[model samples]
Target: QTSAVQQKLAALEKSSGGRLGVALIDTADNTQVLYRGDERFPMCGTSKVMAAAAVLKQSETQKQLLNQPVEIKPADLVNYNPIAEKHVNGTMTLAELSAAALQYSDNTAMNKLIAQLGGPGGVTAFARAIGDETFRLDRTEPTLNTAIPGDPRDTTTPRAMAQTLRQLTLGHALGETQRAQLVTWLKGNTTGAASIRAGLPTSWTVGDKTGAGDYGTTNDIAVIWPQGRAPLVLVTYFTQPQQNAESRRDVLASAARIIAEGL
Candidate 1:
């Protein structure tokens, strides 16, 4: 079954200008892939996955109350567009910030959380603790200036992210409680609507993140299951678009649907 899936994926990649990169892991069977296009690619807000992981780890280590309020000052606001205006100057708990970061990909919320997590330093520590060596948070004057820059927050291979998700899912990344919380938070991620969630049935559950850039890179990492089937971790990335967002959306949707059906 795995070999057949790989053959289909290869054909899909070839048909799609051969730009699609994919990684599929069968957790139950312990399968792995290091395919082309599945290598490390820039991670947009999807990097928030690691950010959230860091926050959860910190919460566990410091015994920080998730519900404790953290003031969101004007300085905490980055990319002050209409979204920032909504929360202009208010306070949100770390839990709330993390929710906003994942659910809406809210830049201000992420910035506040990043700050509280001790900036990039804190995020790096969390990644290291979790054994994600290749994932690096961006450190530049420009990145410091804006919450979500024109570029991605970091770059990571699909394999690394799959490993991260596996740990989180298996309750090995953090404690049991922290893992549960992280999984719950991840299931709430809705930003990947046109990608990872594009193909699953209404009864199926999905925990995933999606990312895109102006340069035409789209990526999604997801844990998915069909009703009555075992869950699987799937990551797909495409760069240097041969088509527009809508076209890419359709392609990814088609691929995801195929995977779900096959499963």
Candidate 2:
């Protein structure tokens, strides 16, 4: 049955005029369905999740990092940074900055967190430390979103994404309190309504992060809890060759529905 669903997903990918990657895992039953799940796709804003996770892990030792006051400078501003723009030259706690990054996909906020984590290399190192060998972050915001067709920089496999997110959101990657904090931030996310959330049943609960980048790249990673079941992890990445091509949200939304039905 899972193979049958993968075939359908492949067909859907073929019709999208681009590449599509998916990784769906039912943690309860340990069942999975993959379509191009091992292929690399751009991380775009999805890297924010990792930044937040890495910072949370750092906080476990730093203790005061989360509540520590941090300054947001005008020099930090970047494209699509509404949240940070409002706070330029102002002070915000590291915890508040992280919330801006995850819940709002604030580019400036994400860069700040990345810096605190040491750098893009630091974030990749965190993933490696957590057993996510396929996850990597080679660049910062706009640059990380270049989405070059054959480029592997700032890219991750859907399987690695789902696995890593599962570890952070459902597994024991962070202490219980920090894990719940990350999950709460994800649940507050306002960016993915038209993607995965749109195709899911309203009765179910989901916490997700969204990504949009050049070359028509669109991605989302989520942890969904259905009635009477353990949580499930779903990741979808889509990309086309044309830089100006429109991102196909419906493709991901429909993919989400298909995955839910399969599980």
Candidate 3:
């Protein structure tokens, strides 16, 4: 009999010629599981985590990043930049924008953060230190057109992403204060909650980032803390445009829940 996680992912893959991908791990022993998860999928908004890590690696707050004021133009407003939506004249600060980009999945804020980080390579630098050299998070935020499977501008393997997430918990480049704030922002992320948070127990604390491409690219990476147990890190990506969006979300959620049960 196939495991529940495999069954869930296989059903998704079978639905679309095996387009779906899933990878999961519990860091206690580096236990792992994967399904068509080695391929690089678009990072989309989830790439914000890289920028957050970069900024945190350098300075402690928004005011510390070279102190140059960049105006948030009306043109910058887009999905999930909740702060931009509310304020008529909003300029993205490194600290605040990092939270918005990570918490709200704000593309505009993300673009600003990436641009400030000395181009796309800056963001990749942080994660690449912890992940594979091929782990390219050097892509900008979604300038999604009619591209297939969203855009390939930003991509990473599920395993690579999971490793990076593990590093986040195990203290890589991020300092104590930076790590805590980053984790808090991720836990507060509103955009990814549907899949990553919904799947976990209500009492369990989860810090996560979510990405969704124009096509069927929906993904999440997280650090999960179950009451008294050690932390678990999981990264899940779904790439079947042929599959229903809701189904992908539910599948991702279910997969996380199943993993947590075993942890």
RMSD of 1: 3.9
Which ten residues in a row are the worst by lDDT in model 1?
140-149
Report the C-alpha lDDT of model 3 over 24-132, residue by residue, as the tens digit.
7766677877766687777666678877777777775554563445678877676556665654475656777787788888777787787777878877776666555
Taking all chains together, the TM-score of candidate 3 against the true structure is 0.85
Highest TM-score: which candidate? Answer: 2
Alpha carbon deviation, residue 15, candidate 1 (Å) = 3.8
Task: Return the lDDT, model 2, position 201.
Answer: 91
Better of 1 and 3 by TM-score: 3
- Tens-digit per-residue lDDT, 96-206, candidate 1: 878887777777777766777778777777888889886777642124322232244567677877777777665388888888887787788867778878766778788
Per-candidate clash tally: 1, 0, 0
Question: Tens digit of lDDT per residue, candidate 2, span 1-263?
Answer: 45878888888888998899999989998877899989999989888999999999999988988998788898888887878887888977889989999998988888888889788999999999999898889998879999998898999999989999999999999999889999999999998999999889999899999999888999999999988788999999999989987988899998998888845
Clashing pairs in 3: none
Better of 2 and 3 by lDDT: 2
Query: Any idea what lDDT model 2 has?
Result: 0.90
TM per model?
A: 0.83, 0.97, 0.85
